[PDB]
Amino acid sequence: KTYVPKQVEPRWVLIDAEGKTLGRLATKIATLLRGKHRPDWTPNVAMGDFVVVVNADKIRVTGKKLEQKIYTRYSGYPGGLKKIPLEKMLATHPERVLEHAVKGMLPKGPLGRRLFKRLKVYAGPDHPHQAQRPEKL
Amino acid sequence: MKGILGVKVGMTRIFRDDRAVPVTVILAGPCPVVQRRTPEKDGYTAVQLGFLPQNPKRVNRPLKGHFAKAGVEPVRILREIRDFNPEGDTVTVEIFKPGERVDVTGTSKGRGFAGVMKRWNFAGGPDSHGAHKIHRHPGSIGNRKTPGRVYKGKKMAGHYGAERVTVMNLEVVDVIPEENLLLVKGAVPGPNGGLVIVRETKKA
Amino acid sequence: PKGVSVEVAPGRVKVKGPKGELEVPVSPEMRVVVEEGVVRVERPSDERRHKSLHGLTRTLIANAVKGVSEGYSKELLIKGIGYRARLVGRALELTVGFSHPVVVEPPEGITFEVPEPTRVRVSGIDKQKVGQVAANIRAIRKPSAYHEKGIYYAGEPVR
RNA sequence: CCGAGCGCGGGAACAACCGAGACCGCCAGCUAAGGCCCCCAAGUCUGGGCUAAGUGGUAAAGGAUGUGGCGCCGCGAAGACAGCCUCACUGGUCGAGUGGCGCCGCGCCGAAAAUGA
RNA sequence: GGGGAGGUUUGGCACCUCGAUGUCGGCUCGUCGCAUCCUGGGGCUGAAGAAGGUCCCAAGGGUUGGGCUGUUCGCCCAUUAA
RNA sequence: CGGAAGGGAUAACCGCUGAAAGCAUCUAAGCGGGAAGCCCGCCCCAAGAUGAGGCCUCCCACGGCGUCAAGCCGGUAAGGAC
Ligand SMILES: [Mg+2]
Ligand SMILES: [Mg+2]
Ligand SMILES: [Mg+2]
Ligand SMILES: [Mg+2]
Ligand SMILES: [Mg+2]
Ligand SMILES: [Mg+2]
Ligand SMILES: [Mg+2]
Ligand SMILES: [Mg+2]
Ligand SMILES: [Mg+2]
Ligand SMILES: [Mg+2]
Ligand SMILES: [Mg+2]
Ligand SMILES: [Mg+2]
Ligand SMILES: [Mg+2]
Ligand SMILES: [Mg+2]
Ligand SMILES: [Mg+2]
Ligand SMILES: [Mg+2]
Ligand SMILES: [Mg+2]
Ligand SMILES: [Mg+2]
Ligand SMILES: [Mg+2]
Ligand SMILES: [Mg+2]
Ligand SMILES: [Mg+2]
Ligand SMILES: [Mg+2]
Ligand SMILES: [Mg+2]
Ligand SMILES: [Mg+2]
Ligand SMILES: [Mg+2]
Ligand SMILES: [Mg+2]
Ligand SMILES: [Mg+2]
Ligand SMILES: [Mg+2]
Ligand SMILES: [Mg+2]
Ligand SMILES: [Mg+2]
Ligand SMILES: [Mg+2]
Ligand SMILES: [Mg+2]
Ligand SMILES: [Mg+2]
Ligand SMILES: [Mg+2]
Ligand SMILES: [Mg+2]
Ligand SMILES: [Mg+2]
Ligand SMILES: [Mg+2]
Ligand SMILES: [Mg+2]
Ligand SMILES: [Mg+2]
Ligand SMILES: [Mg+2]
Ligand SMILES: [Mg+2]
Ligand SMILES: [Mg+2]
Ligand SMILES: [Mg+2]
Ligand SMILES: [Mg+2]
Ligand SMILES: [Mg+2]
Ligand SMILES: [Mg+2]
Ligand SMILES: [Mg+2]
Ligand SMILES: [Mg+2]
Ligand SMILES: [Mg+2]
Ligand SMILES: [Mg+2]
Ligand SMILES: [Mg+2]
Ligand SMILES: [Mg+2]
Ligand SMILES: [Mg+2]
Ligand SMILES: [Mg+2]
Ligand SMILES: [Mg+2]
Ligand SMILES: [Mg+2]
Ligand SMILES: [Mg+2]
Ligand SMILES: [Mg+2]
Ligand SMILES: [Mg+2]
Ligand SMILES: [Mg+2]
Ligand SMILES: [Mg+2]
Ligand SMILES: [Mg+2]
Ligand SMILES: [Mg+2]
Ligand SMILES: [Mg+2]
Ligand SMILES: [Mg+2]
Ligand SMILES: [Mg+2]
Ligand SMILES: [Mg+2]
Ligand SMILES: [Mg+2]
Ligand SMILES: [Mg+2]
Ligand SMILES: [Mg+2]
Ligand SMILES: [Mg+2]
Ligand SMILES: [Mg+2]
Ligand SMILES: [Mg+2]
Ligand SMILES: [Mg+2]
Ligand SMILES: [Mg+2]
Ligand SMILES: [Mg+2]
Ligand SMILES: [Mg+2]
Ligand SMILES: [Mg+2]
Ligand SMILES: [Mg+2]
Ligand SMILES: [Mg+2]
Ligand SMILES: [Mg+2]
Ligand SMILES: [Mg+2]
Ligand SMILES: [Mg+2]
Ligand SMILES: [Mg+2]
Ligand SMILES: [Mg+2]
Ligand SMILES: [Mg+2]
Ligand SMILES: [Mg+2]
Ligand SMILES: [Mg+2]
Ligand SMILES: [Mg+2]
Ligand SMILES: [Mg+2]
Ligand SMILES: [Mg+2]
Ligand SMILES: [Mg+2]
Ligand SMILES: [Mg+2]
Ligand SMILES: [Mg+2]
Ligand SMILES: [Mg+2]
Ligand SMILES: [Mg+2]
Ligand SMILES: [Mg+2]
Ligand SMILES: [Mg+2]
Ligand SMILES: [Mg+2]
Ligand SMILES: [Mg+2]
Ligand SMILES: [Mg+2]
Ligand SMILES: [Mg+2]
Ligand SMILES: [Mg+2]
Ligand SMILES: [Mg+2]
Ligand SMILES: [Mg+2]
Ligand SMILES: [Mg+2]
Ligand SMILES: [Mg+2]
Ligand SMILES: [Mg+2]
Ligand SMILES: [Mg+2]
Ligand SMILES: [Mg+2]
Ligand SMILES: [Mg+2]
Ligand SMILES: [Mg+2]
Ligand SMILES: [Mg+2]
Ligand SMILES: [Mg+2]
Ligand SMILES: [Mg+2]
Ligand SMILES: [Mg+2]
Ligand SMILES: [Mg+2]
Ligand SMILES: [Mg+2]
Ligand SMILES: [Mg+2]
Ligand SMILES: [Mg+2]
């Protein structure tokens, strides 16, 4: 009968964002958010590392993107569809662009959100120097 | 950004040279600056004005401390004029030379549950020629199977007035520091005895 | 390329001279060999992209050089009856028909003179500045296409 | 083939399209179609090209010094192609490439819709 | 003569609905589309100017009151930036 | 009394510098200007922004149980409700 892990401790990680290609980084970030790298992986628990990102304001992204490529929010009201280009996202709160990527990469369930909270993204550098600052690339 | 609390006292016309003028009196009252906000430990600049004397009855609260910490007569009301920054003491009608124009924020009278006719000035049915049981109704509120729902924010009967309203760019017709009064172009929201806040406008 | 005070950077040449200094943004992917007295522009590959960038930077650097040494300056010609130029300390002011005389101050680095109420010595070190501010004046009142009025350069009219 | 296989895998979802005919059980193994960056199992695999349009992510006649590949035909160090009013051409001079056509791959324009993408 | 776009018209097909999906016009309330009527910005003009013509960009807002007819539409009166 | 003024980024379009292509070219690198439209600005809602934010001031021990940990039960405090 297959092994079930018990209450273990979350491994807090720290990733430097600047230079990294947006989507490419998000993918790995997501994987870390779930277990999926720890061989005691369990799909219904929440055991992914606490990823911390810094210098997110400096994420690289190929092609025209920034100019083109737009994020759309929808208010409930008529015409309530807002459209905001990648450019202006970074202009203001930029950690958004990475978050909206990692979030869209997490499973959509009630667990998915638990995990989305373990992801801490900052304009960086610097952040809550709690405990582990295990540089990672 | 100038500013000051006060009460709508009422209104009555006067005579600028030979020319009638509608005017509403506001009791600017003396306002003791109770506290200052600042980016230092507030993230923004603003002055918390006090207004109207409050006897130590209901002041039993921890307000006594917020009051003593600035050492000021305990007031009955206190709001923040944002981005205003005068001088550790008091602001009065002296802030407003006649001719300046001021925005004025008050709370509209309360219509309670108002029909679509009064709330939104809908047309409603005809008093005659048929229907009869729809004289003041809104009529249609949608389409058919598509969208198959009513639009969010559809004008419908509900509570009217009794809300934060701000008429703008009113002319300060006159000011009488002797009685702490202030005269403007009359059109200020809320009922007499209603509290209100005057301040500098936007125009240039 | 004499009088050159060039200096290669991680991605931008910097020429200097008696007249001033100008930073010339050149694509990093180009060899900007600075010879003892004659800078060269080398291009990796015979590709299409690189050709264009070569000839371009090849000129921008030369343009900065001739700038900090000789300098650039455009010549604007006023026309039409009422129309007339006139300097004011350092800012140019001109009447051209509108109910108000146009007051155009010079942007930093730019300097225009008025040798006559019919000419404008727009002068500076950077070619961009000049070429711009030049046309920026001609814009204040482009050439009349039906007569012979308004600002002009030094080339034939329209009529 | 569905009907009677709206039982199973793929095609986002979808009777008849691709795989395949479910007697029951198994916390075993191998493959099919389709896939192997994350949502989601499996290579961000190896070697070589093409594309710069989000093309890919789904439209035509037709149009264009987009971009690579191929071929033939005209001028030229007897100095050629541009601009030095010039094209031709000699002294000029960068001087060694240049002009025309045709075939292929990928792209570009042509390309306007009604609740929010 | 040739190629398309749209799904407002006129049609074709007979797939849902016949143990029921109320049909025209008006009123009330609108919202969306843009292939734009007006206002805004532009290119060209056979653009002197004033005014037009045509194409381009552009929904933000606006887009009148009556006569005849059930009419939609249309015609007409008086206006309009329309 | 309101539509704004103003700042920013732009569409068509107008340019600067400028090759690929010794010329030329607003463009391929790069820069300027440019709409009642876009983002701000104005007014209103707004921390169930479960990502539940901030600031000022006020009150503060345990009284018997739970041997562990989360809790239970009487009187209170600031203060709140009837
Ligand atoms: Mg992975
Ligand atoms: Mg997103
Ligand atoms: Mg899951
Ligand atoms: Mg799902
Ligand atoms: Mg959800
Ligand atoms: Mg009264
Ligand atoms: Mg403080
Ligand atoms: Mg604060
Ligand atoms: Mg009270
Ligand atoms: Mg009503
Ligand atoms: Mg009303
Ligand atoms: Mg009414
Ligand atoms: Mg009415
Ligand atoms: Mg009846
Ligand atoms: Mg109905
Ligand atoms: Mg629906
Ligand atoms: Mg109410
Ligand atoms: Mg209001
Ligand atoms: Mg009264
Ligand atoms: Mg009263
Ligand atoms: Mg003319
Ligand atoms: Mg069968
Ligand atoms: Mg089934
Ligand atoms: Mg079934
Ligand atoms: Mg399937
Ligand atoms: Mg199937
Ligand atoms: Mg079937
Ligand atoms: Mg089947
Ligand atoms: Mg079978
Ligand atoms: Mg059996
Ligand atoms: Mg079996
Ligand atoms: Mg077993
Ligand atoms: Mg086998
Ligand atoms: Mg096998
Ligand atoms: Mg993989
Ligand atoms: Mg998903
Ligand atoms: Mg995987
Ligand atoms: Mg790969
Ligand atoms: Mg490869
Ligand atoms: Mg395109
Ligand atoms: Mg089509
Ligand atoms: Mg196509
Ligand atoms: Mg076709
Ligand atoms: Mg065809
Ligand atoms: Mg074809
Ligand atoms: Mg074709
Ligand atoms: Mg052809
Ligand atoms: Mg192209
Ligand atoms: Mg070729
Ligand atoms: Mg020849
Ligand atoms: Mg000859
Ligand atoms: Mg030669
Ligand atoms: Mg030939
Ligand atoms: Mg052939
Ligand atoms: Mg297109
Ligand atoms: Mg369009
Ligand atoms: Mg659409
Ligand atoms: Mg015909
Ligand atoms: Mg014909
Ligand atoms: Mg035909
Ligand atoms: Mg139809
Ligand atoms: Mg018929
Ligand atoms: Mg039909
Ligand atoms: Mg049928
Ligand atoms: Mg049949
Ligand atoms: Mg029926
Ligand atoms: Mg029924
Ligand atoms: Mg019928
Ligand atoms: Mg009928
Ligand atoms: Mg209406
Ligand atoms: Mg609309
Ligand atoms: Mg829409
Ligand atoms: Mg116009
Ligand atoms: Mg025109
Ligand atoms: Mg012409
Ligand atoms: Mg004439
Ligand atoms: Mg004329
Ligand atoms: Mg409309
Ligand atoms: Mg009418
Ligand atoms: Mg009638
Ligand atoms: Mg008819
Ligand atoms: Mg008709
Ligand atoms: Mg008719
Ligand atoms: Mg007719
Ligand atoms: Mg008119
Ligand atoms: Mg007319
Ligand atoms: Mg008009
Ligand atoms: Mg008015
Ligand atoms: Mg603006
Ligand atoms: Mg600025
Ligand atoms: Mg600007
Ligand atoms: Mg914008
Ligand atoms: Mg931009
Ligand atoms: Mg130019
Ligand atoms: Mg460019
Ligand atoms: Mg090219
Ligand atoms: Mg630019
Ligand atoms: Mg600028
Ligand atoms: Mg600009
Ligand atoms: Mg303009
Ligand atoms: Mg504009
Ligand atoms: Mg305007
Ligand atoms: Mg206006
Ligand atoms: Mg727009
Ligand atoms: Mg609040
Ligand atoms: Mg709260
Ligand atoms: Mg709070
Ligand atoms: Mg106390
Ligand atoms: Mg306590
Ligand atoms: Mg204590
Ligand atoms: Mg204590
Ligand atoms: Mg004690
Ligand atoms: Mg105590
Ligand atoms: Mg413990
Ligand atoms: Mg009790
Ligand atoms: Mg108690
Ligand atoms: Mg006490
Ligand atoms: Mg008390
Ligand atoms: Mg209560
Ligand atoms: Mg009470």
XYZ file of C-alpha atoms (C1' of nucleotides) in Angstrom, chain D residues 59-61 111-117, chain E residues 2-8 32-33 35:
20
model
C -10.732 33.287 -46.077
C -10.304 34.793 -51.999
C -9.215 37.268 -56.697
C -9.407 41.432 -43.605
C -15.841 45.608 -40.907
C -20.588 43.221 -36.075
C -23.398 43.492 -32.854
C -23.559 40.895 -23.845
C -16.771 40.302 -22.170
C -12.644 38.926 -23.831
C -13.492 38.772 -61.936
C -12.964 37.960 -56.129
C -15.009 38.698 -51.379
C -17.107 40.401 -46.665
C -21.593 40.793 -43.721
C -26.193 37.748 -41.886
C -30.436 43.984 -41.821
C -24.480 46.659 -28.202
C -22.197 47.033 -33.546
C -19.861 49.803 -42.559
